[PDB]
Amino acid sequence: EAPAAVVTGAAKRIGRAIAVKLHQTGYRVVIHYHNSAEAAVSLADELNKERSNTAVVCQADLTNSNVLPASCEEIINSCFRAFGRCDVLVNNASAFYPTPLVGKTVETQVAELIGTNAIAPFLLTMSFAQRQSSNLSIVNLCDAMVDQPCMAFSLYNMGKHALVGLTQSAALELAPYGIRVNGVAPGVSLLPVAMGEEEKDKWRRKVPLGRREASAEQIADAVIFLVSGSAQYITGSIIKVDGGLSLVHA
Amino acid sequence: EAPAAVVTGAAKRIGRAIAVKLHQTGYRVVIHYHNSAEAAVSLADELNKERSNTAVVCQADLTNSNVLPASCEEIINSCFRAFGRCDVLVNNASAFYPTPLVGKTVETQVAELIGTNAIAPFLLTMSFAQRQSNLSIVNLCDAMVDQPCMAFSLYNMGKHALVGLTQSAALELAPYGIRVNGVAPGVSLLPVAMGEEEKDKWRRKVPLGRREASAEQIADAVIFLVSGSAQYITGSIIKVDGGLSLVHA
Amino acid sequence: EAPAAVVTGAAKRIGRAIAVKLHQTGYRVVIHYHNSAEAAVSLADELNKERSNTAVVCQADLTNSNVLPASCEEIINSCFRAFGRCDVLVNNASAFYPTPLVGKTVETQVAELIGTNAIAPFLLTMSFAQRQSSNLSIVNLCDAMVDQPCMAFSLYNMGKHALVGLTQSAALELAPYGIRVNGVAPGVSLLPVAMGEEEKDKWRRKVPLGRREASAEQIADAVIFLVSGSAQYITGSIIKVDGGLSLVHA
């Protein structure tokens, strides 16, 4: 029987590449998404055409609220519903926008940035563990620049720091249940075609290894490693995939 | 004119020692509290008996909610209203209890532990900044955050986010001349009512004297960071833990 | 044609496991050793029996001294001599013993512990770089417990910190040449018969992931990842392979 994974925010970009790569490795996948319904269904179609009945979509808002625990539990439930098991959880979904200290309310900024980046991963991790030869693991998508943060992104940065804290705490506490917990910390990756060519090149030049952002495949390679049998002693570890960006001083 | 400080969770223990020591240095203080009303009031009395019109109290729940921004703004307002200025913020209030991954609801646990330890500090920081000399914020962190207590994952997530705020706010608020730093205790002031074997177990692991920190020892590191001797220091977290975080399993 | 790797301290334990796994993936290997000549020679013999002339040995004390720079240069030389190229360097050899602050002289303690653990890795790194779809990389064997160090192992711990520094500095400096530099930080692995039973039991019991030590092959897995094509954007990273041990408080 093929193991099954949940990838949050999987309809596009790095989450999509993670889902594709896990599918290519033999996983059945729950493609979770929030607003990108067309991209999600189109991805699930391509994967199921490749192998029947090995991909489903699952919609959920991961903004913090009093029903967020039930939403997270239902994402987990959808994987058991569809495939009878849940071996891997990848927490990739993330809100990302500036929140200067000096048109969303601050309440909403808090709920979106802290919810997606930290509270949802915590509640999904609860639900993952509670619901449980086997190679069980969680991979959190962290951020290699967490200690040299982007100006005015304080709530985003707080959320990613909390995610490292969850990675550690959960690796510690889920170790006796055989569940490993680790992270992948991207530097700059897959800059949106949207963004100006001059701004993208600004970021690119700073990266020592090749003066280029990471491809989505490159991030995904690190995730595949941590879920594999090749990482069975690895827990509480966070792998930077940043081309040395975090080593460059101002 | 004497500078003014807000101290959250200041009615008891480390927050109290922090308020007293700032007061002793010349600060006027806002004593924030949540449930410890008598202790907050008795402390203001004691400080005002030393120097009159130098201490007030302000009650607020710092649980995450749709009204937390406004409560935080009022905590800062209460310092301006009483004293005409606000030079220092100490983010000390903290909820602390286990939250196992496997009778409060989980959303309440989330609200309390992430609210007190991180979101409230962020909102207070925003309100403090927005209103703006030697300005500085000191956040009470945790020396054990990378070797955390089993089953305290929300508390640890909150403390990790607080370091993130410390760094981010230090970076963003530097052009205003506001420094943002942290003080990370190890074990301090273990309650009389905790187990004797339990406390002993922690105390014995502490390399520097086999004992917990007193509250005054934590307060010392705060005072230093707010002082004129810390004018170039921002984004730094001082461990005050007797070497405890250095000790392997 | 086939890439080539230098592995230091490769005769026994983790270093041997590394050398074997690189050889299995198709590398030719220089097995460096210091005192373990019988094991080093046997290992190269076994590897050569598998694929002809794909393995050579090279002996060198990596203690710090005036001749250490030429020894390190001859080790790299030995890989170009044998195989025409040197794609991978693995810095694994390490002296390890207590040096209390309060009968080798202390200057010999310095020379051994800092030499093997830091200075030699630096000199091999220089010689590796000076000699230079290609995939060049260095992997340094670090230590997961470096911030919670063993009582009375100051010089060991100083050496390992220095190795972290090299990892970071060299990744930065060698990125423009296409050479990646990373590390792998074991927790406890392969505790020998020679070590006290009390002491061993104390360590194994503290490991969250399964209350046991890492196997050598478990450490080697992480090395193979880092040198692989699936790590092509990773440089300046250190992967803990420690079973969660470094997350456990006193």
Added chain:
Amino acid sequence: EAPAAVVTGAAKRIGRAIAVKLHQTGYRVVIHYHNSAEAAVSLADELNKERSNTAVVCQADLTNSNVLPASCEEIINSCFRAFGRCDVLVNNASAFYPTPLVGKTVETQVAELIGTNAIAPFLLTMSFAQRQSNLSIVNLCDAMVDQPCMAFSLYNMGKHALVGLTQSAALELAPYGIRVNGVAPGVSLLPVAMGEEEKDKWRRKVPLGRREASAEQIADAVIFLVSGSAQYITGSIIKVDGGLSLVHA
């Protein structure tokens, strides 16, 4: 009677500023130096003019060698010989120059950069402990160790090693009441002789005031760590960097 401090590389710049402040706080001091003989004696003169018999010089090369342990033991011995005691060791001396991977032999580069920045501090610390109240060591680290200067690999390796010593020695020496801590500058007191443009390049990157630290600002942090306000702080490293280490590329 007054306590005593050894300060390495104390003739000029930050070490001098540290020696001066310890002296102003009441310490007697050993001004160690290697080539700056004239500045060193000139400084001891001035300190003894203020209070007689409170300052000596001690010359030593702290390059790694088989005699380095003897030279380190002699520096501590010089403190007991002049003042009858040794309360504070400050490890400040440091070689700093590039050593690219791709006239000094590399063996000499290794010896100077690893000797001054790590091995000498380790052997000074050994000698300090064995020759033994508020006893403490302060190592001058570097806030930029994880984002290092290009081509400074032996320098960066030394400063990392020094972090590791700070930790190991805090752990091991705690049962003897010796605290071990560090101060990590960012950019401080850039050479008046270094190019203006280069200097402004670094100064512009510093969030807190777009300027380097004064030597006095670094010393303030040292002074705190040796003081009675830091009695429970060991194994801690205080960044004094104006936020420099927080700024991304």
